[PDB]
Design a protein around this ligand. Sequence first.
Ligand SMILES: Cc1ncc(C[n+]2csc(CCOP(=O)(O)OP(=O)(O)O)c2C)c(N)n1
Ligand SMILES: Cc1ncc(C[n+]2csc(CCOP(=O)(O)OP(=O)(O)O)c2C)c(N)n1
Ligand SMILES: [Cl-]
Ligand SMILES: [Cl-]
Ligand SMILES: [K+]
Ligand SMILES: [K+]
Ligand SMILES: [K+]
Ligand SMILES: [K+]
Ligand SMILES: [Mn+2]
Ligand SMILES: [Mn+2]
Lengths: 369, 369, 329, 329
Amino acid sequence: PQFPGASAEFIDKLEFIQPNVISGIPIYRVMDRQGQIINPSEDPHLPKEKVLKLYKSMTLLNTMDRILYESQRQGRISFYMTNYGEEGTHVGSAAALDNTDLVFGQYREAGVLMYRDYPLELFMAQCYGNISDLGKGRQMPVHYGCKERHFVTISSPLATQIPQAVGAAYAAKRANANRVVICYFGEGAASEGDAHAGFNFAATLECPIIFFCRNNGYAISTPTSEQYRGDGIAARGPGYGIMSIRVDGNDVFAVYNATKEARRRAVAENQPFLIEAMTYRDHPISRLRHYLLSQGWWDEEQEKAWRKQSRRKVMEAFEQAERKPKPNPNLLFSDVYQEMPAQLRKQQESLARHLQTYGEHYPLDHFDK
Amino acid sequence: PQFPGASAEFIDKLEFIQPNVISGIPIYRVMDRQGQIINPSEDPHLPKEKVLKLYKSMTLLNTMDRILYESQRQGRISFYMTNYGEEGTHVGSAAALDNTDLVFGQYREAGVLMYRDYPLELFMAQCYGNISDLGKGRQMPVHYGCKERHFVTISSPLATQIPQAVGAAYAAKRANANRVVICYFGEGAASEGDAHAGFNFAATLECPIIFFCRNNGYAISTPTSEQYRGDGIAARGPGYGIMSIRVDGNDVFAVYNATKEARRRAVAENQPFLIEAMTYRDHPISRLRHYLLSQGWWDEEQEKAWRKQSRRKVMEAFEQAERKPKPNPNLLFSDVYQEMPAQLRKQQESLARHLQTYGEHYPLDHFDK
Amino acid sequence: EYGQTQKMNLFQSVTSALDNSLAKDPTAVIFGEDVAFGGVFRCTVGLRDKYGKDRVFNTPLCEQGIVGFGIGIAVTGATAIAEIQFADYIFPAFDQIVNEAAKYRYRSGDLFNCGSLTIRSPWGCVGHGALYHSQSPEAFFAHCPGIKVVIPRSPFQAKGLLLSCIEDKNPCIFFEPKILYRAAAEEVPIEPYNIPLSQAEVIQEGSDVTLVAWGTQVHVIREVASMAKEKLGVSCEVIDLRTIIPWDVDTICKSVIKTGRLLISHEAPLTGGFASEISSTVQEECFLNLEAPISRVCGYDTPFPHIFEPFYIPDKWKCYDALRKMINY
Amino acid sequence: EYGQTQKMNLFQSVTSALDNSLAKDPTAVIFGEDVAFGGVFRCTVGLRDKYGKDRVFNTPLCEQGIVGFGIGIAVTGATAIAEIQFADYIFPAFDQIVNEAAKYRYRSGDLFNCGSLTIRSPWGCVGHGALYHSQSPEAFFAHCPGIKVVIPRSPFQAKGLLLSCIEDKNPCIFFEPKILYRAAAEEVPIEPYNIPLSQAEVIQEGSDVTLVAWGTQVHVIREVASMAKEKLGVSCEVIDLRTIIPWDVDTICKSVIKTGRLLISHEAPLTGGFASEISSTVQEECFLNLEAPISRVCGYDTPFPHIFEPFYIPDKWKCYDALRKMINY
Ligand SMILES: Cc1ncc(C[n+]2csc(CCOP(=O)(O)OP(=O)(O)O)c2C)c(N)n1
Ligand SMILES: Cc1ncc(C[n+]2csc(CCOP(=O)(O)OP(=O)(O)O)c2C)c(N)n1
Ligand SMILES: [Cl-]
Ligand SMILES: [Cl-]
Ligand SMILES: [K+]
Ligand SMILES: [K+]
Ligand SMILES: [K+]
Ligand SMILES: [K+]
Ligand SMILES: [Mn+2]
Ligand SMILES: [Mn+2]
């Protein structure tokens, strides 16, 4: 055949190509449910200090989740999204990145920030929208962002970050400084048009990006049977020309290995990689705990002391966060554009005049002045 | 593994899944370049009358193209899109449909209408925007539509028809009357978000639809190397759970066979099928002509007489179309909503008043009154 | 007046409309994200069990697909009631709404249409929704000939307007004020009834000033009328616009010819907001009657903030102060 | 004033701006559908050969991707100049523009931004473009705080405004009137120069009436000024708005305080069109000066038709007749 659109032979018999969904792409695993290494040639043999850091980051995240989830139940904060079941995918992949690799995500990615030593005070400041929040209290809780830790601010519209992450990866390529971009999203978000945009552009424009899809079988109430009919998201990668793998999201080492190799090859080859990590909506923390014990790297006394200390650190941050004032209400007007248009300043002055007269009717008590 | 998102085994070794683009999905062919049947078990053995109708529909389309393309070059009509190279994909697939199957498309689908006996007068009326145009002269040329022949009016925004065709297919399923929907689009249009929407919805919602992608290697100036990096569009179907095939678009019989089988199974099984037909931006007319000759079903005298008669019929329609007036300018206001809002009627009255006073400055000469 | 009623909040009134629709129209289907289990705001509770999984069903998470799919159902003549989970997430579908749904009938010379489409979506502020759980997008749609945009103020109004949208032969967007979903109930007829589209409602007669709003903001202006009467001895005519487009120009102009003053209020940002269209039109038609400049009391020209919401919204004090100044112009 | 000039039509002036940008900003890239070979309107001819395939390149056919990709480039600080092939096809990107680009700086507290993005797109009627080759979408964007929308009237203005957009630290949409691409040339400086954003230009002083328009419609109102002077002895002040948002309120209000009459014109449909925002604002600020109702002479509230275009557009006779009536009010 002589068609520029595809490289292929002729066939003289009519045969439709059938999807293989019943036996899909297999799920890569490094350690079993008892924390045992299954195949020694795949063991990354991470040193004890780093593995303890993976474990403490996961558990600290889990401690923070418990407390802020309760805070939400009481209306102390307006909203919360937990990380339960996603601690290993995020901590394990973050550990495989270079500290300056740029991260785009959404609602399940706090563990990346935790691994990058984001202060508990700042997670809280964002949820409370208090004066310490660098986001100036403008977004809903858990909409975290950190310029110093290369974690691009979350936004509620699903999948919009995917083609943006590809653009940042293209710019990184041009800048030539050995950086990857990683982009996290759920299996629900992968149904958006923007996912098809980002996957395709990353391949045709040859971008050093890792797409990290978390597939936990549900998008709110919708099971994956109503979300897609192919073999999950991993089976989509090859149709875009993207190298693809599926991993056990309860296995921090499998996540680490796959992300480390994707990062190495994405940066060297300027091509996208897709990792689909399977999780539940047999936990990553338990599994790593079993592993630590086998190595003689943890025990019940250490577990108790850390549980105690992590609760103390989170409660200290929690209490301070609740006691800080909210930002000055003037801050509602800045950063709409870099400068403030004259007409916008007029509106800001109109609010200042209004509060002068009717201020008793506003909760000024709580806001910086 | 116990993950609801995918059905798969574990694997204990890290292995990325690689796309197979160099040897892609093979291209189904029934007859060679000399019009010879390659594999007798695949010959549809269509009767002489139907095969002559395929040939005359293609050539008549080609005759009309030549004339209207020249008309466009002279500014007699404002715009034109030809069907060159796409005569076989459209005539061959149309022949495999039931006359009441609903067709969505865009700019390359006039042959479907031609096969369905759309009058030459009406193709012309749309291009000229004259009083005979059922579209009332509102859209650019070649934006054809026919309710009686179940061909949904074309619109310029690429790929928007794809999720709509899926919706019409869902509605057909519910209505239970053994109808398919077919949806045509190019390989460029397949990059749109709406293509990912329609493919996915058709699979999860189990819709009796044929997606017919024409891949001619180019979208305006853009070669497919800049459009995608997987194995064309056919290789995308399996990732959505869609049964998929690639065919030789210069081979009317291969197109016919694939569309006939896709239609049979889509309606029986309520599942989508994707056909990717490879064309050039070795012609379908020449190839079928060679076939007719081998059968003793055509010869040079018949070819001459038909060339003459088809030119005459198109020129008769062309001349009549140019001489008809354009529709009443009042028609610019109707059908915006089913009824006319009072405020819109006010605007229509404002134009009538304006023309009463300033009419000499408008080309009223040409418009119905 | 309308048969037996029962107390319903706004989400229940929506379910009642949808149920009545499915009962009387065998073609009708309801679809969108998470509609099957009853929806994130409970508007479709019970309907799948009652009418069948082929009629009340979840789609993949893809708004441009939801609307394109809905248009396709409507092209065959079947009633398509699409849900977009928050109005904030309607934008991925903007091209399918503006370029496709709105233009479908016109561009085909009425050979094809999607009149049997209705898109319903939660709308407006909710106390803590911030940038993407709060938006009021009606002005974006107001500039698009060929769609209708309708916004109710209460459960009784929601069911009557939604039934009219579903039955209207044009693609309709119906925005449901989410802060009212579980607010106070009122009596709502159990059987179907319609409230006409493109018809404002004067809910309180007045002689000194006309106040216009829609959605939850109608309740704000009702209160402002009360404050103005008590504090200023000023008599306000309070009007719920109800349909954004095509809008009831005559009812608004008639009121302003009587009062000579107009104040329009909406949660959406001032600039390019729908108040600008009403103001400009009233100015054209009522010019010689205007005693004072028409005032617009709207959201600021910013994204919708989380912690600053109490300071952002055009509340009753903002409306009252504007009114005071206008009465004194 | 600006160094050596040469005659350029509007497409050539755009190429000149882009070339100057790439020359002086090593980060800058240009991308979109069919830009590599020079573009369907020839705006990028020569640039890929001059600056390299990594800097001037084609994307897949996917507008929501083009804008999302552009935003991502800009998030790293690099200048991203995206093309959308016709403004009519900007809608697939509406969510990326409105929900993402416009809100990027605000929602992050200025930790991240996409100020270095500019989206350029052909705009406005072209004689036979019909529904999808003709649209003027500026009002849809005007209701979105956080983006700027800019529309030039000539080659000199295009290059100066486009350079300002590219350099402005906010995401800008720059609409190029396609009917002017190969219309008359004028002298345009070869070297870079800027024209300020959010600044209207009074191109002709007048005392009896203010006329406001943008894009090609500026030429229409210039002619209307001439007709009014010759036929009515009426002196018109002619103003090109140039930036749709943030718009130059002061220059327009100052002119109307002087003249006491205002007529605004645009190709876009009347309802929800940007004329409504100007009218409502001028009415608020200039109320006591208004001798006559502010008039809006716009496209009708329909999709943009093919064969009926000559009857659809707010041409010089439509503008003149409105002006005559206003002068006589
Ligand atoms: C464009 C858009 N539509 C809908 C939503 C509402 N929504 C918030 S989370 C969610 C489910 C997301 O599922 P998935 O991507 O699988 O992530 P998971 O919650 O399972 O981690 C939905 C529909 C949204 N935020 N954005
Ligand atoms: C949303 C949108 N973007 C861009 C265009 C401009 N456009 C008209 S045809 C075309 C190329 C289409 O390519 P393909 O789908 O491969 O069809 P082909 O022309 O090759 O038959 C483009 C970009 C359009 N009509 N709609
Ligand atoms: Cl959300
Ligand atoms: Cl086009
Ligand atoms: K997002
Ligand atoms: K289309
Ligand atoms: K309807
Ligand atoms: K910019
Ligand atoms: Mn999920
Ligand atoms: Mn093509």
